[PDB]
Amino acid sequence: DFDLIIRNAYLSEKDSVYDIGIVGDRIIKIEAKIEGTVKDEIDAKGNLVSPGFVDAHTHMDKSFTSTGERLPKFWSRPYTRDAAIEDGLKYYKNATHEEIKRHVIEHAHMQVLHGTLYTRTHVDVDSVAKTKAVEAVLEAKEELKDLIDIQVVAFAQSGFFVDLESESLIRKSLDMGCDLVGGVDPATRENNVEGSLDLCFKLAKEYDVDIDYHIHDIGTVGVYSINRLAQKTIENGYKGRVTTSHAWCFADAPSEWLDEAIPLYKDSGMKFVTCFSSTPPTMPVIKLLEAGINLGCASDDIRDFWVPFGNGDMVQGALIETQRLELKTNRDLGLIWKMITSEGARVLGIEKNYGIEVGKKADLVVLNSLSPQWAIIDQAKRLCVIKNGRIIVKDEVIVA
Amino acid sequence: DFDLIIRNAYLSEKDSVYDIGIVGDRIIKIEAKIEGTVKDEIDAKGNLVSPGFVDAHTHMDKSFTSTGERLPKFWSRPYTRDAAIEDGLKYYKNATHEEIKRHVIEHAHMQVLHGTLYTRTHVDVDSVAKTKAVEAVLEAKEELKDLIDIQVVAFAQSGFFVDLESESLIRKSLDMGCDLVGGVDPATRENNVEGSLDLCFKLAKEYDVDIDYHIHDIGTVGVYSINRLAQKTIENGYKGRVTTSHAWCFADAPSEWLDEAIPLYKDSGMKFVTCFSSTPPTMPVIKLLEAGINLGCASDDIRDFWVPFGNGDMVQGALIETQRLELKTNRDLGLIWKMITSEGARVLGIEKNYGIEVGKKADLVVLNSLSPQWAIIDQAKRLCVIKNGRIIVKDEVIVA
Ligand SMILES: [Cl-]
Ligand SMILES: [Cl-]
Ligand SMILES: [Zn+2]
Ligand SMILES: [Zn+2]
């Protein structure tokens, strides 16, 4: 019979309560009542059971570097991208393989305590970090495979045309086994939009990897950089293989620029990720989703020299998004929930095995709340977390 | 001898770790090490101990009315003030004294679990509620005297010049013992700014009570309404006795209007409350505080037909404000912390007995975090809550 049954699980997509039967790492049966009994059971008690949350953009390598003292380190100054880059170069100067590795494990545990079972982390690759951070992350990734699936982005944080050693280092990193490649700000960092982008596509083709680009530039220069990225996506036959992270520019650029760009994004299969530690309040999130653009959600940095905040909790991030974007209706909170779940899945390219349906992966979160909406509102802690059909978290403890 | 000693308490205002000695409801000794006998002790273990949080604007009477189903009630339609007023009139048509009372105690317990020991609630007074809600709240207030101090605003939710029965009903309500009086939107609700305000000042003088006004109107009409309120504050000799809640208008009105109004606000001793369930993202919070304007913070409604959110947790609210306003520096998170503490106290008029100083009330919160900043960031649960020198909360349960 079953390896695991979840009793009395409210499923949002079906709007009813079901027993869930699991064998190995797969969901086999979803029924109003499953008969009769097996060794491992979890009673969800009428509360929501959800697939694992998806944190589509993190920086596990540099997380928790702000911790250590009474006040967060690094935060006696305001945030600016270039200064945050410089703090990274100091930090990476003499950080050891093991300090990074432990940060990554710490990060993952926190995430998984909150029911995130899938994440895509960017890792700094530049002339100071070299491939040291890539090494530590790949190593930790391997150790964490029973807790959390990780996609790794070889991330040229300093700029391909600013730090001229980046190209060969990204090349090593991808050969070490990073799963995607990405740059930062073609325009205001690189000062070369065509060049930075072409180089990124070249590297992606050499190693047959997907792309995740950090585009922070605000306004029309940001929309323009994404437009170029999207057009080159088509030219290079990379439809559906490119993610644009942040895209804060959609918030202040004229709405017309977005209206005109949307068919291009749909035609290029452009994917986006908005991080709840920075989503602009006038970000047209709802509009993007209603237009059928694939928009995921994410923590971004956690407790470092870019972002002091962070608990790796996508349910807390959903609440933050509702506040940033002033959402209140059940429909809208419902859309945000999709963003931390199935939209993130699609961004990650795992949609086929993702969801609470027969045949899907037994990667689940049993919550202490009645519905997506109530979970966002009441912020109750996770009751149970299940990965590969095995219970890995039970009542605030990693039991794996 | 002490009735209570808190060991190893990090105090933000002193930036060091101290023992806190308490007798009855008072702090009597603060010292690096307190030798002496003692009945009860709490070890804060190097973590931050803070005074009780101040939730300067709530609506305890209608709270939790959204609860009951799988999805929040009322949230199949978006929010507009007038529609919310209409849901209240339906709700209040059939609500019983006991229902309201229970909502108020639930609300208070929740607040207190999170270390709020002081709150100002508004209570709907209009031709449907009549004084029923005032009755339930005053009764509950009495029962809750050992957990939380409550100020009650007789609040003319429907408008003095719209619901004509409001004036006599507010009179009764103040005679029943409400501590302040308040209206809503002189301009777009009442359609009479001079009249609505003069009437309010009239009722305040008859019963010698302070004023708390809901001003939601956006833009210049909002600034104008507050300017008239502030000028009439001076004319009526009510300096320091008037609070403006919300003032969303400061966010979209031209910055010049605020610049010119600031001396008037200082001159009138105008107090403000921003609620974290609605603070506009471009609200000039930092600017107000730097100018020495007294700005408190608050939950506003909790789980009702105005706001579906709510946990009565001012530490969670502080995180939300950092996100709404995009704050990250230690200095700014510090200012937000003042807003949920000492600024709220000053809005309430209790600043003299408020704080962790010798002679002050023994109303305290022992946290599981190192500092104001880390508390906002890590959102750790409260370790211990102390009111009137007695432990009322210990490990997520009310032990009073
Ligand atoms: Cl170019
Ligand atoms: Cl008028
Ligand atoms: Zn990033
Ligand atoms: Zn209000």
Residue numbers in the entry:
A (entry chain A), B (entry chain B): 4 to 403
From the article:
AtzC is a member of amidohydrolase protein superfamily and is the third enzyme of the atrazine mineralization pathway. The active sites of the independently solved structures show similar architectures, each having three histidine residues coordinated to the zinc ion (His60, His62, His217; 2.1 to 2.3 Å) as well as Asp303 (about 2.4 Å) and a water (2.0 to 2.1 Å) bound to the zinc.
Trp309 has been shown to be motile in the comparison of the ligand-free AtzC structure and the inhibitor-bound structure, suggesting that this amino acid moves upon substrate binding.
